[PDB]
Amino acid sequence: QREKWSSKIDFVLSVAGGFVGLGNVWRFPYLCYKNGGGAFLIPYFIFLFGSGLPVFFLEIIIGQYTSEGGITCWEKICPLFSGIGYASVVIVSLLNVYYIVILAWATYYLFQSFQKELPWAHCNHSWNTPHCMEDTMRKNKSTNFTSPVIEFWERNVLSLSPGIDHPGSLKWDLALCLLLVWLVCFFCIWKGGKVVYFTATFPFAMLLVLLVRGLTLPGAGAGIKFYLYPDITRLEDPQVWIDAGTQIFFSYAICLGAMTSLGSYNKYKYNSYRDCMLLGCLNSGTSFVSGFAIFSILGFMAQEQGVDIADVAESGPGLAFIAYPKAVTMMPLPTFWSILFFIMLLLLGLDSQFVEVEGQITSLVDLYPSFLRKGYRREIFIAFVCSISYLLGLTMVTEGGMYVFQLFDYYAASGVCLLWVAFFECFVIAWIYGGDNLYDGIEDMIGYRPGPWMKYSWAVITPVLCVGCFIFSLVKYVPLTYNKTYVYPNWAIGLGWSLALSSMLCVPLVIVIRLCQTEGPFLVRVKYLLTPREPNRWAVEREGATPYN
Ligand SMILES: [Cl-]
Ligand code: NA
Numbered sequence: 193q194r195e196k197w198s199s200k201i202d203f204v205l206s207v208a209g210g211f212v213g214l215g216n217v218w219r220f221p222y223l224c225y226k227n228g229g230g231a232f233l234i235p236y237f238i239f240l241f242g243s244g245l246p247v248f249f250l251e252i253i254i255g256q257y258t259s260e261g262g263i264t265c266w267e268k269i270c271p272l273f274s275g276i277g278y279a280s281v282v283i284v285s286l287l288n289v290y291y292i293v294i295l296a297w298a299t300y301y302l303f304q305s306f307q308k309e310l311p312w313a314h315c316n317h318s319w320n321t322p323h324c325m326e327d328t329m330r331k332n333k334s335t336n337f338t339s340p341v342i343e344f345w346e347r348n349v350l351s352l353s354p355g356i357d358h359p360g361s362l363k364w365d366l367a368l369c370l371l372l373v374w375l376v377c378f379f380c381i382w383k384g385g386k387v388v389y390f391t392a393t394f395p396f397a398m399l400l401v402l403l404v405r406g407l408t409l410p411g412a413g414a415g416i417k418f419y420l421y422p423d424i425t426r427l428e429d430p431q432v433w434i435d436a437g438t439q440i441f442f443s444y445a446i447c448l449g450a451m452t453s454l455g456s457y458n459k460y461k462y463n464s465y466r467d468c469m470l471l472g473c474l475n476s477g478t479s480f481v482s483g484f485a486i487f488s489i490l491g492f493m494a495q496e497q498g499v500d501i502a503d504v505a506e507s508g509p510g511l512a513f514i515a516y517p518k519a520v521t522m523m524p525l526p527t528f529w530s531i532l533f534f535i536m537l538l539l540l541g542l543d544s545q546f547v548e549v550e551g552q553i554t555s556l557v558d559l560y561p562s563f564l565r566k567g568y569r570r571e572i573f574i575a576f577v578c579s580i581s582y583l584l585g586l587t588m589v590t591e592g593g594m595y596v597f598q599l600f601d602y603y604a605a606s607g608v609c610l611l612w613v614a615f616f617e618c619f620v621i622a623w624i625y626g627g628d629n630l631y632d633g634i635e636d637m638i639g640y641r642p643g644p645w646m647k648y649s650w651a652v653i654t655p656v657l658c659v660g661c662f663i664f665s666l667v668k669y670v671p672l673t674y675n676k677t678y679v680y681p682n683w684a685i686g687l688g689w690s691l692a693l694s695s696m697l698c699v700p701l702v703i704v705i706r707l708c709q710t711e712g713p714f715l716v717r718v719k720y721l722l723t724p725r726e727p728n729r730w731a732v733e734r735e736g737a738t739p740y741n
Pocket of ligand 2: 211212213215216442443444445475
């Protein structure tokens, strides 16, 4: 009874809009700048060509073959590890909490651009500290200054607190912006062409404009050089490897249960290998090229401020909110380009949020189709999920909430919680299910048996990379720090560990539940739970699909 796309273009557009966005223009530059720059790229490419792309194609193929969402697909493929799907849902749930907060910030920035003079271009505003000085005069002539862009980002937008211990009050403006963005998402998903042909083209046009401005900026060679040339000693730090590996999985929206849902509506006989490789190349190119735009602007900022290239902005989240607003003021008619850039950011975030929330809602409804979809209950369930995600998301809107955002960024829907899923998705498919059986299924679907790249990537490369990163992170533990200065308390790291474990522990918990529920000897129960029960029964009966095995 699964739906099918139309003309096969809707699927491509949905995928492209779902796995490109804030993870390419916001998270990637800030992670690259936090890890030293060029040293971040080598693990990025190692996890990009040995994994990430194969895992993305695996999720798409699982969705298309099983014709099931993010949960039932693993029930069909391997019942015993069905909890993997549950874990994915948990991850996306947490991702739906903090990933939209960024849009609120963007919305606030947009609501700040409607005035004649951009508020982040002078130090004479009320919120500025006496240490604020204009960057042009900062180079000339117990002595520290703060750039007006960073002053606006910290004092006005974030209203940052001494620490996560002090949350302060709720920022009414940011809370209203978050509520507006949640209302937009809920109205779009609940109830809702050539219009969409310009909602995935304009962001790329603005990216091109930013690229041009950054490249033509004076003193941008230092920024490009900091971005490219790597450092071996930083490659010897496990933090770079784990950050790059988890950025690869975050950007491609894998281990979330969303890409599987997107692929579930594909036709059974549809060459999704090319359509999943071209889009993956587009996503990687978007990230890599936007890195140039961010780092050329950072190099110009460092040249004009007279400071180090790595000491001109925030190592944590908000680099895109300190760098791009600076280059915006360097272009003629700064207000026009500020509005355009923040509209681009809003589009890139809203499309991804729509895709992720749609995947989560589809996966949750598939559990109880006759109760949570029958009648009018679907609307009520979507409203309840959005309201809960909004209320649980107001903890990052308070004055001391920015730190909470980082706790969600580093641990929830990232970090080892991704690896834990990525190891299990590839282990079940390659070893328990069988790489050759899935290759036969792919040969039946796309028309030709692929090369040995996918099989080796699922079997050897991805599990080894995930377990090596896990072991390296555990052996050499670097506690999470905000902007290289803040030290989270014990309970903050405990909360981050709890957020990670909430999704991580779903895989063994469901295994235990299945083992206890099944009767007979343990060996018999394991054999029963490790046997896929008609993985493509719907595809076999509906279409002319060949039976599994
Ligand atoms: Cl990326
Ligand atoms: Na992405």
